[PDB]
Design a protein around this ligand. Sequence first.
Ligand SMILES: [Cl-]
Ligand SMILES: [Cl-]
Ligand SMILES: [Cl-]
Ligand SMILES: [Cl-]
Ligand SMILES: [Cl-]
Ligand SMILES: [Cl-]
Lengths: 194, 194
Amino acid sequence: QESLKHLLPDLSDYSEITIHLLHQLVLACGDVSLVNAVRLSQGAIASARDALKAGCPVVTDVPVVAAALDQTRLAHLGCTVKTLIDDPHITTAREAEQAFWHHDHWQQRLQQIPQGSVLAIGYAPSVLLTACKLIEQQHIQPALVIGMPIGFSHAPAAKRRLMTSPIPHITIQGSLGGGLLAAVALNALVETLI
Amino acid sequence: QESLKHLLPDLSDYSEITIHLLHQLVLACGDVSLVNAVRLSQGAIASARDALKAGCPVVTDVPVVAAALDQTRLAHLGCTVKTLIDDPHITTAREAEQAFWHHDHWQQRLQQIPQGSVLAIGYAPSVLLTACKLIEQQHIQPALVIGMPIGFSHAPAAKRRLMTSPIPHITIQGSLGGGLLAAVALNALVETLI
Ligand SMILES: [Cl-]
Ligand SMILES: [Cl-]
Ligand SMILES: [Cl-]
Ligand SMILES: [Cl-]
Ligand SMILES: [Cl-]
Ligand SMILES: [Cl-]
């Protein structure tokens, strides 16, 4: 986070973009704690911008997250938005984990994530875990993974495993997650490019 | 708060309901801090359950909050759900406050809130301030106010002024807010009644 201010000698404005992202998160959720907790892989920002400019696919885990995307701006870039499951009313880590336990083939829908797309997981730790495993096995190659699910007690070490991965990622070290946080972050990346 | 356990010698089960509500909030947003911050007026629970059983109106501030309500369960109870503005993409304290600045007439729509309804504010502090003022002037009489918007720096003392109000309320002492928290609280009150 604050270490990421090695971004300062850069020509790039990845400094300013990172702060916009933190600012939007705080303006969404209401606590400054996120500044410590938010971890962005080096070249996360850069990977995002290159993917979006290219008009990549976006894949969210639940519909709440997709519905919070700046759908208009994204479509102007040519990005499609899809979700792993279509259950309307997911509003909780539990509701999410149960929704994904009752769906038989969402793992297949995840495997098909096209090369170099953005994967944004806001609710379910199991999805994030599976996405990590798939990435390590080199079955999916997304351009970026925003993993911000809720973190419960004696959970999948999902966010902890995400941080240690080859693929650019944005995540929240710790339990905090859910809400619209993943959509909020991706939105911040799409405003700073339009 | 923790004090709300004067509810224990009660026959009532408002104890268990209060804990379920906190459990749901924590499961939604991901931090336990909320248990301190969450404040329920005495008989908030009781007033909510009476209104919901009666098939009251539910009025949220933005569409995100309504869309996160347990729409079916609420509909079986006879509750209609409406919103003060119909702008699709509100996702941030800033986005909420400005959306409410471009609408001329949400003030009238709030004044018309029917007697004994539930008022649920998840995003805009200015709406919450207005509703307090209207309640004090005795121009609206809702059954309950879930005020859980974000609290920014140099803000209206919106959630601060709610605590000072005659009408039963559930609120978050502090800045934390937004997300789906207001919907999640009302949902907890609707499950415990079905
Ligand atoms: Cl660039
Ligand atoms: Cl399925
Ligand atoms: Cl393993
Ligand atoms: Cl009762
Ligand atoms: Cl209007
Ligand atoms: Cl005043």
